[PDB]
Structures are given as C-alpha cells and as structure tokens.
From a paper:
Lytic Polysaccharide Monooxygenases (LPMOs) are a recently discovered group of copper metalloenzymes that depolymerize recalcitrant polysaccharides like lignocellulose and chitin by oxidative cleavage of the glycosidic bonds. The His-brace is made up of the Cu metal center coordinated with the imidazole ring Nδ1 and backbone N atoms of the terminal His and the imidazole ring nitrogen Nε2 atom of a His located later in the protein sequence. In this study, the focus is on AA9 LPMOs, where a conserved His and Gln (His147 and Gln162 in LsAA9A) form the 2nd coordination sphere and a strong H-bonding network has been shown in the crystal structures. Our results reveal that the conserved His residue of the 2nd coordination sphere in AA9 LPMOs is generally singly protonated.
Three structures of AA9 from LsAA9A and Thermoascus aurantiacus (TaAA9A) were determined in this study. Three out of the six high resolution AA9A structures, two from Lentinus similis (two different data sets for the same enzyme) and one from Thermoascus aurantiacus, were determined in this study. The data for all the three structures extends to very high resolutions. In TaAA9A, the completeness of the data cutting at resolutions of 1.06 Å and 1.2 Å are 40.4% and 94.6%, respectively. Thus, all three datasets have good completeness beyond the threshold of 1.2 Å considered necessary for partial unrestrained refined, and therefore, we decided to extend the datasets to include higher resolutions, which can still contribute to improving the data/parameter ratio in refinement. His147 in LsAA9A and His164 in TaAA9A were investigated for the protonation states at Nδ1 and Nε2 atoms of the imidazole ring of the histidines. Here, the His residues (of the primary and secondary coordination spheres) undergo unrestrained refinement, while the residues in the rest of the structure undergo restrained refinement. Our results suggest that the His of the secondary co-ordination sphere is singly protonated at the Nε2 atom in most if not all structures. Examination of the micro-environment of this His residue in all the LPMO structures of this study show also that the distance of the Nδ1 atom from main chain N-H is between 2.75 to 2.95 Å. Therefore, this N is likely to serve as a H-bond acceptor and reinforcing the view that the His is unlikely to be doubly protonated.
Author numbering: 1 to 228
Write the structure that this text describes.
C-alpha cells in the first residue's frame, strides 16, 4: 500500500495527488498527477485488469497540469514508504495525449513500455526485486524519457506490482500512478501502443506466481519494451 507523493523534474518538485488528503478537501490543488479514488492506498488486482481502473488506478481523472521534461531528462517519482513484503516489478509506460493531457479519454490511451525492472537476485527467496531497489533508494524511482520518441504531451503510467499474495488467481496487486508530461526534443518514433485494459491478464507468468519458491527467471508482465 502506498502512492506517489512527489515528482522531481529539472530541479523542482511537483507535488503529487495526495490521495489521503485531497479527496477530503473542498479546494484540492491542481497538480500534474491524476486524481484517484484509491483512498485505501490500495491496488487494482486481476479482477480489474479488463476494467478502466487498471489504466491510472480506481476512478482516475487526468491532472490539470503538465510538467515539461528536458530532452532525455529524468522524472523521479517519490512514494510513501513501500513495504518490504510487497516484492515485485516496477514498470513504466508512456501514452500520447495528442492534445492537452488534462482532457484525454483515458480509455483510448495507447501505452508503450519505456522501462521495466523485475527480479534482481534470488539467493534468498523470495528474493530482491525492483520494489526493493525502490525502497533502497529511499522510496524513489527514476525514469529517463527516451530521446527517440515524437515530442508532445504524454501520460506517464508508473507502476509497482506487488506479488506477495500472487500465488492465487487475482492475488497480484497493481499500483499504477499517472502523471502528465510534455516531452521535448528531436525524436520521431510513435511506438506501437497497448490499451490499458490489454496490458495484463490474471494468468500471466509474472502475475500468477509463487515468489516464495526458488525462481530461475521472471517474465515481467505487459507488452514488449520499446527501445529506439
Ligand atoms: C537518497 C538515498 O540514496 N539514500 C538515503 C541515505 O543516503 C541516507 O543513509 C538515509 C539514512 O537512511 O536516508 C536514505
Ligand atoms: Cl480531489
Ligand atoms: Cl491549485
Ligand atoms: Cl491550491
Ligand atoms: Cl509502509
Ligand atoms: Cl500532444
Ligand atoms: Cl538476499
Ligand atoms: Cl527479500
Ligand atoms: Cl512532434
Ligand atoms: Cl516464467
Ligand atoms: Cu499493500
């Protein structure tokens, strides 16, 4: 359980959607982060993978604001403290807004995978995962925006999938968090995208999995990584 509280881009902080605060206030601020209704700080499990909740989390709506990113710049997402038990991959996607991200129809977003990290070491099951790297980095993840994609406005869909209960069907816990970015530079690719509701299925080999056994490999969920 947790959420993204802060985003660091080009030497400033952009506050996140504080789902434990803003849903209870009259006058929540405009932010680059999507609003959600996930006030339990929880997840979308496999029962939700073919529902709109998986796109940017339960009840999500676009952020009002969009953050510029320098060409090939970084976006650092800072989480609330991530539980050690919640082992799993960290995955990042972009989808073009083709206009202002604040007015996009989330159900039409076509995401391409720009980064993925999975099982890092398995000397001591259940092992060390990308989520454990995130914890070790004081609950942070750094995304590098590709220089090879067409400039424009994009949604970044940043996600942890916790696998501590994933031995049974619909037991994996997905924690998507979306933010709005303006990508800048000289790239030209328009990578092939996947609708949010087509990213995952509840029988995928990196979804329906017993992490407590020895693992010789791990198939990170979702469509293929884009590399320009
Ligand atoms: C940003 C980062 O890399 N890690 C820090 C570490 O340098 C400092 O040891 C720690 C004391 O736990 O707060 C965390
Ligand atoms: Cl709100
Ligand atoms: Cl505001
Ligand atoms: Cl305000
Ligand atoms: Cl925690
Ligand atoms: Cl655009
Ligand atoms: Cl270990
Ligand atoms: Cl471990
Ligand atoms: Cl362009
Ligand atoms: Cl496998
Ligand atoms: Cu949890």
């Amino acid at each position: 359980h947790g959420f993204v509280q802060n985003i660091v881009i080009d030497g400033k902080n952009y506050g996140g959607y504080l789902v434990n605060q803003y849903p209870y206030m009259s006058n929540p601020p405009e932010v680059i982060a999507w609003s959600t209704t996930a006030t339990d700080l929880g997840f979308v499990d496999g029962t939700g993978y073919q529902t709109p909740d998986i796109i940017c989390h339960r009840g999500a709506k676009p952020g009002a604001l969009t953050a510029p990113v320098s060409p090939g710049g970084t976006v650092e997402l800072q989480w609330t403290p991530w539980p050690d038990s919640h082992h799993g991959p960290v995955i990042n996607y972009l989808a073009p807004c083709n206009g202002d991200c604040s007015t996009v129809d989330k159900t039409q977003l076509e995401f391409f995978k720009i980064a993925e990290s999975g099982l890092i070491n398995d000397d001591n099951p259940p092992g060390i995962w990308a989520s454990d790297n995130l914890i070790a980095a004081n609950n942070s993840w750094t995304v590098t925006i590709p220089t090879t994609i067409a400039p424009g406005n994009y949604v970044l869909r940043h996600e942890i999938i916790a696998l501590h209960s994933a031995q049974n069907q619909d037991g994996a816990q997905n924690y998507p968090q979306c933010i709005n970015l303006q990508v800048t530079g000289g790239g030209s690719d328009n990578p092939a995208g996947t609708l949010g509701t087509a990213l995952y299925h509840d029988t995928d080999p990196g979804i329906l999995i017993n992490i407590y056994q020895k693992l010789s490999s791990y198939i990170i969920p979702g469509p293929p990584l884009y590399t320009g």
